[PDB]
Symmetry: D2
Subunit: 494 residues, 4 copies
């Protein structure tokens, strides 16, 4: 069931959110927000800069002080606030999904049925952890009582990408708040709108002021201010590996703040000859084409065993030729635009390298339409490992299909990348499923599926695809700081 | 009981250790190793550089390959090798403690009774974790079987300080090996000798070649090579906050390798009027003067409530006037030298600032002897928060004593530092013990004691005193990399 | 704020609840339910027997079958159903608290502000665990992949006491359902009504049929049927140690079903001379008099150091003389009736032993009123360890106060009982707080408080006060069954 | 490599072991110990009774008192003692394996290579847990500091079976001692000798007196004394389900002591048509015939899909016809005797039911030899579910092979038993491996293997095959007792 909003969307929240109030930029400057399907301006939003980040950090620091409402409230009450926030997002599901679709160029069916469902489910999952974050009592040598506190770290700077604005906002704030941190959030310059609406709901849910602060603005200004700030305890960032490197450097040069990064991928799939072929084709297809290819985990290198390679390519091409391009709000449309010009240019440049370096173009290969940042869904076969399209994250609707004969060799090829976010293995062989998944240098490995992500599972990269994990039990670790307390006693007993 | 070595120590192991063999430097260069008590040369050791680090990383990468002996052996067998290594260190306890004392300027009683005991106990603790590192099975949404593997990360670069060469070597290699990593270790240029002897014992214990590689050499050459290497997965470093910042930057600029840091401190103690005064004096004393003040956790700011301040200072000064300076090998000697000239100069410069900025010198305040890097044990009272001796890590035998009247204010003062490694609270009040320890921004808080460190407890800094934790259950986390494996199934059941 | 119900309570749900429908007893028999404040009949309820338990177990077995809705639904959806049930209980808070007060003789303020709040909070806590119950992946010796599943056990028989009917219903069903079990619940014969209303809400919330089945009836018939049933996997029981012994025997003689028991106490407090005296008096007072003394954790032996004993007794007696006895529904009334005649008789018999064995009666000592099972709040001083009132659980408003001079001796006296549910320690001494609490043989030890119970903490007895723990992370263990799965693989890697 | 003892075994330790000394029985009575291969008397051992169990419990209670050496020593030192004990068992490996083989009728190769290796490995595993048993710090509602202690339970009665005397002794004492309990051990009347030798090694290793006490004697006397004792906190028992029921009853009737049970099985294997047939035959074969069938996990019902059934039976019969019966000490002998006359009679009676109820005898079916309790290895095909040999644990070298066509039906048949210890699934289908193993009601499920048991994995039964788990992380839970300590504080902070 796909219900829709019955009135035109009106944009209300366009200002900086600090201490549960709306602020103009210190500059007085604003910046435009565009719709990528029409190239039209949707509205202007206050442009946050270093001066505004400083106000937000001061607010978050004050909300984190010992004795404050956020520090002293029961853990179970932090959980309650998060479950309330999920209920409010559920209440505003139609408007949020519309806004997400309109600002982000995201298919409305996916926005409503997947992104919003995921936001709500993830918030509810995180809410359940709040009063279940525990330290330890430890049988130390000598006559001492030793325990640990898993405290919140403090003020967390969180830089959110444009590809999944609402989902990634919640993946960041859910665990951070559950653990008792305060946050300064910088949504993507392309997509600040849904975050600002969520801020209105944070205020409505009853979070104490300064617990969540949202500063829309640009990467090289507001993002750099966050990453270099002397009083931000931790920075979380999702986006390009290139910017990830700058964040990690700036944290080092400033105040040695903790850093977690979810970055690019060039994720491989390995399709063995014994695989359920149709299942592999469909998952690998969705794996690379989901959200116009604008996913870190895009299955952007598909290695298929020689004997089923031709059949795999044929079936893949026929699936890729079935899309309907257009405005992501219109029912039945199955491919929206890319987010902006830079991304659009990068994709087209990479598609040209595939042609020029001698990959076989099966379909697509150019732009589409008179308006919007649309790229035809593109398939390349006979791709080799040295090609630009085999090495660089495209972040567009561009599928690479390669052949292999040797399993030893294809695992090396799969692993022969600085990336390491995810991988897929398609086989009916139990031993191969376990041994291949163990040998792949990737944070998540799917077996006979692809792109299955849930709140209960930790998610993150090996190698240059990231540092740390988000979600699951393990993800909550990087939002706590462990303190050991050791007390002298006259005599200990087991 | 303090037994001693019956024959003069002969130095045997002076070369680079790669793939369980001894190598000359690619350069052919060597560097001198000095005794800090005599200023005499002990021997020459092969100088490792980028070229030699590259050989060690290649060896560690090869030992980490899927299907290798170190990857395929039972976890319990990794544990067995570590327990064997502890037995061998126990066997060579007299020679190791002598070597440590002679190279490191460390009191032999402490070297033998504390450092060596700690090495052996920590190795045994780590050995027990090897087959107890477990992932999870997770009740993910949808029809899937999801589990996690807590894999080793891979090749870990480990840069060891000069203050506790053997203890810190084991704090690094114990957990890394227990978890199944391979290591490239760079001992301090001042103190490579005990590490090279341990390398001989790693070979004897039966570790596969390339699992542990030890490259003596300099920070700006070998250390920088490690931190900037494109095929090192993780770097662990203990030392100055200043160098810590360079490590974190270089990791960012190179390959986004994981980084854990244990850095400086300016650790405070808070002594309430109701404290057991003698107990507080003794622990705070040892807290700052241990190993000639060359401890990250030095209790280098002691805040004492006004009404007991004078009595605290008097009792502290009388304890500090009881040392016997000399060669750390001679029985009854209770203070050895500082490690080298740079450290010696820094300490003397800081002692001069205390005098010039108007702190009250109670005892000490200058050098001692005609040879060696000896500093008189020094006490300053009436220290204020703006003084250099109150802000900068001295890393020398220099005690600062300050007064307070307000508990609110003194916690702010205690926390008013970029450091955050440890703290001490001395009180008989249950509520104060719990509330003060919660409010202090420090990784370890001791109550009615100080400097109590054990293998069972996680250890590390808040703020610029470090990133991550070592030892305990929690410390083992930063030597694993979590992989999620998600398998499509027809139907799941709880 | 104490809001109240605006219309007279009408009783609606009086039948057996199996497969989400209302059933008459197979017998056609019914039994009366009384109000203990008036001795008046409130209604008749269907009397369940072995024949009816058999129907409920068949329903629970069927709902637990592989492939069923309850087995196949997402863990997060079990959580959702539990959070929905808490919302519904919150919606019906006024009627449930009134019903609880009227049927259970429980003060309405406590029923509304404590019991109902606790039900809702505990359900919400349990809901959060549902998708966080995880097994392990284990580095077994040899070439195998080994993981564990923490499965639900299956059909759980749950026998609920009359003292906290709603709270204990939720303490039982919350964790059992969160873990994925199905349940057959036998509320106390005295207090079936609130459970049957909750059953109506389980149906409304959308739980699949047969997941929760509620069979009102008698202990020796329905309770014995549960404990002896050949197809019930686990029995949970809270009540007398005497009946606890019969349950454990019957489980042994039948099908070796798992057993957890929360039984009686004779919980001691130790009040040191340095204690905050007023704080100790108030907590020890509420500790023994809460809900007319009808709490397993009643602080029924208070040991006070000689020098403050007289002052403690005086202050205790003055607090005990301030109650207003009456109908628990009338505002300002501060003591309701005992639950029934058997309990009333037992209490009066025990009070008579105190007088006859030579305890000093400070106040109370007899019945009150012309209707209802009221006992005057009673205090005895100079109680000695051999007295019946010092050995037997009274389960009434009867406080015992004893003196001690030796701490060694008083810990022995405190521990010298077959019971072991809880204990209290009142002192300002950190060392004493830690060492005494370690030495006491009791499941929960309170320091400078008493009777503090929360969903986040495991709760249960040492010795004959119980087997197992409820609530907290640890309590969820006894509602799972661990299955190890070990898979042969060609080669394992760490 | 199978080394052997170079001198005849002399029996030395034949007395009751209490407080690290050797005691005669209070009665002065002794009982004979026989060799099952020759039926000859090996020696006489002191017969312990209730009077002797009382002495052992008093010793264990005293060793468990607060302030005792076992309670106050560092957890790491409990670990050290256990690793020392493993080294001593390793030192005495030849004599222990010989003694085990001679007393227990166990093949010497297995005794030496499996049983002794398993004892040593399990002890070492347990030693590693000692200082890694941790409680929690918990974010309770309200202004409180709450932590838990995972204390030892206290005096644990441990009743050891005759089939794996040394392995099961260590499976019991390893975890119990690691957790800090004291034990009263009752080895099997048939096989007390290896336990008494281990007791000599417990004394030599330096365990404090009263920590381990060993009382040889009979089940209905010494075993019943243990199970009914008013001051034993916990009883662990491995043996028949029948006696398991008596233990659980007696615990209920006496002092509600905690009970863990590992009991019989009638463990099924399911062999799908797509299985590696030879691998399935070999594992199922060893699965049922290991140690003369005297294993709780015996694969005593093998269900094979119709199309491969005949081939499975043929290959099974040819493997079963290859044994060499004789004295378990002679090299090349591959089947020893059954333990005693009762077991021998039960096996022969059951083999007769198979013949008489119409199972097809493929080989064996009678006794062997002029001395010893030898049974010919026996195979029955065309077994049906109602046959005695399909329902009753034989505990002898008797293999049952059944056919199936329907997977739904065979899972029901597999589960249609009151037992539930283990199961095996043989298939090449990933989905079937996961779904079948989830659906089987068994504590351990092997996939493409059988009988793989390791220290790292929890082990125990569903249903009437047991209560609780041994070994792994999870097994350590049933040797601790959780105490919650909740401390009033002025203000809590996260
Ligand atoms: C990691 C991101 C980039 C994943 C974006 N994405 C999604 C939709 N997601 C967003 C919402 N998210 C949740 O928060 C959640 C919590 C509980 C259940 O879901 C689930 C994943 N579906 C996908 C993909 C995808 O990136 N690829 C490649 C695919 O193939 N499919 C099918
Ligand atoms: C953190 C380092 C710099 C601590 C160096 N240090 C030591 C001796 N240590 C080295 C060996 N170490 C262990 O590995 C261990 C494992 C199990 C038991 O001990 C224990 C701590 N004792 C100290 C101090 C110290 O730095 N300060 C300030 C003190 O006051 N005391 C008493
Ligand atoms: Cl911890
Ligand atoms: Cl995990
Ligand atoms: Cl487990
Ligand atoms: Cl716990
Ligand atoms: Yb254009
Ligand atoms: Yb000099
Ligand atoms: Yb009456
Ligand atoms: Yb015979």
């Amino acid at each position: 069931d796909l219900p829709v909003l019955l009135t035109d969307l009106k944009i209300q929240y366009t200002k900086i959110f600090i201490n549960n109030e709306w602020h103009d930029s210190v500059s007085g400057k604003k910046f435009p927000v565009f719709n990528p399907a029409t190239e039209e301006e949707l509205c202007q939003v206050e442009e946050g800069d270093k001066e505004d980040v400083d106000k937000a950090v001061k607010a978050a620091r004050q909300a984190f002080q010992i004795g404050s409402p956020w520090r002293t409230m029961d853990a179970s009450e932090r959980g309650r606030l998060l479950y309330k926030l999920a209920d409010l997002i559920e209440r505003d599901r139609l408007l949020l999904a519309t806004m997400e679709s309109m600002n982000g160029g995201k298919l409305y069916s996916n926005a409503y049925l997947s992104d919003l469902a995921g936001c709500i489910k993830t918030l509810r999952y995180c809410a359940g952890w709040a009063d279940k974050i525990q330290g330890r009592t430890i049988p130390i040598d000598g006559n001492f009582f030793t325990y640990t506190r898993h405290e919140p770290i403090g003020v967390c700077g969180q830089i959110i990408p444009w590809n999944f604005p609402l989902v990634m906002l919640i993946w960041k704030i859910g665990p951070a708040l559950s653990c008792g941190n305060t946050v300064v959030v910088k949504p993507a310059e392309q997509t600040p709108l849904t975050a600002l609406h969520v801020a209105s709901l944070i205020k409505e849910a009853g979070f104490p002021p300064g617990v969540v602060n949202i500063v829309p603005g640009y990467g090289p200004t507001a993002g750099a201010a966050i990453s270099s700030h002397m009083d931000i305890d931790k920075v979380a960032f999702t986006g390009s590996t290139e910017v990830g490197k700058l964040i990690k450097e700036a944290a080092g040069k400033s105040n040695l703040k903790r850093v977690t990064l979810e970055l690019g991928g060039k994720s491989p799939c390995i399709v063995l000859a014994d695989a359920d072929l149709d299942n592999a084709v469909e998952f690998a297809h969705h794996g690379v084409f989901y959200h116009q290819g604008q996913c870190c985990i895009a299955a952007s290198r598909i290695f298929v065993e020689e004997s089923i390679y031709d059949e795999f390519v044929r079936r893949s091409v026929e699936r890729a030729k079935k899309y309907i391009l257009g405005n992501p709000l219109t029912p039945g449309v199955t491919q929206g635009p890319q987010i902006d010009k830079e991304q659009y240019d990068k994709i087209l440049d990479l598609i040209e390298s595939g042609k020029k370096e001698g990959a076989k173009l099966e379909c697509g290969g150019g732009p589409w339409g008179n308006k919007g940042y649309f790229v035809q869904p593109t398939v390349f076969s006979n791709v080799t490992d040295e090609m630009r399209i085999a090495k660089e994250e495209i972040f567009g609707p561009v599928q690479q299909i390669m052949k292999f004969k040797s399993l030893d060799d294809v695992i090396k090829r799969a692993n022969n990348t600085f990336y390491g976010l995810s991988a897929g293995v398609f086989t009916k062989d139990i031993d191969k499923a376990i041994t291949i998944s163990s040998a792949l240098q990737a944070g998540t490995v799917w077996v006979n599926c692809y792109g299955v992500v849930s709140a209960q599972c930790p998610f993150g990269g090996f190698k240059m695809s990231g540092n740390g994990r988000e979600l699951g039990e393990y993800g909550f670790h990087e939002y706590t700081e462990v303190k050991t307390v050791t007390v002298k006693i006259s005599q200990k007993n087991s």
